[PDB]
């Protein structure tokens with residue numbers, strides 16, 4: 001028998017809330033980066049790592065984490081992800097001194113480990129909890145919540161922490177943010193204990209009901225995922241797109257100031273528009289995918305619009321019109337962020353009935369690997385040859401992704417399971 005539980009929204013809302021808190025702490029150091037350099041007496045690279053350590057810890061630690069999800073369950077993944085997020089939030093509090101910088105790195109590394117229990121999870125929570133006609137919407141909401149934390153992270157820290165020269169008052173203002181983040185993370189950890197269940201009493205869809213029957217080596221599951229030609233192409237293409245987004249969002253601030261000097265206030269607005277429009281695209285992508293069930297056609301269409309959005313952004317940023325950059329960043333952020341739930345759900349189509357944590361996780365490793373490569377590479381071309389070769393470097397690599405995306409077969413295995421009747 002198949003039934004849909006009413007508490008599915010609470011689980012996603014709670015998951016989106018404490019993924020919002022975890023994603024907030026990724027960017028809270030970079031939002032007031034100019035302040036933390038003065039407080040801790042460190043260079044901008046040190047602070048920029050505090051945000052880049054999220055990507056470099058995901059690459060090696062995902063496979064052990066994905067193994068924990070299969071063996072222990074989703075609730076243990078949620079508790080550990082919430083507890084480490086809460087533990088990392090509290091460790092940051094004990095670091096409110098100019099000479100006590102390493103405690104933040106220890107606190108940030110603990111949070112960065114908690115990301116491994118977060119970023120690959122949204123497709124897993126959506127599958128276990130939500131039905132066939134709302135499975136892709138739930139994944140978008142989790143990405144909506146994760147992107148909301150970034151969106152909140154741009155404007156909340158700068159008003160909680162004024163750029164005051166006095167150190168003792170600056171520590172007090174920074175302390176208030178840490179208490180609030182520690183307060184909400186502990187509050188959300190409390191909710192995860194009582195809200196997050198291991199699984200609903202009834203399977204939501206025929207895909208999950210059949211998955212529980214046709215679900216032993218963990219490395220065998222890894223091997224069969226890479227035996228899939230379609231999934232391997234999707235792993236590369238998703239990394240080419242999501243990795244470009246990480247390089248685009250990180251280097252967006254320095255690219256605008258290169259052409260529009262003295263617009264740091266607007267550069268943050270532009271960097272907020274790419275996220276403000278980002279979650280609107282993510283939610284729309286979830287509803288559109290579930291209404292039409294065209295996962296392959298949307299993947300190519302969104303990927304091309306990502307490419308066209310990057311081409312128009314590259315060749316119109318030079319013209320000197322500020323509102324044009326607002327539209328191009330918003331439009332590209334609309335599609336690139338909308339590709340994240342589309343990529344997660346299309347991977348489940350190609351890799352059914354393999355574990356959604358492994359399938360969507362392997363997309364994330366490619367996103368981190370290409371995001372790290374692009375951020376280091378595009379930063380080098382911008383410094384040496386200019387900003388336009390750096391943006392074209394993403395246009396050329398996104399062009400390859402579109403070509404490889406067209407080679408992905410429309411092998412929707414989960415859809416076949418639903419329609420078996």
Ligand code: HEM
Nearest residue numbers: 004005006007008009010011012013014194195197200201
């Ligand atoms: C009066 C007796 C009520 C009962 C016995 C009841 C029952 C439930 C149950 C069983 C759940 C899911 C939790 C779970 O399955 O473990 C739930 C959640 C919920 N209930 Fe009720 N309900 C009642 C009244 C109401 C009313 C009047 C509202 C008015 C808005 C409401 C709004 C909600 C909402 C919004 C959720 C989902 C929580 C979320 O989405 O965050 N309930 N309720």
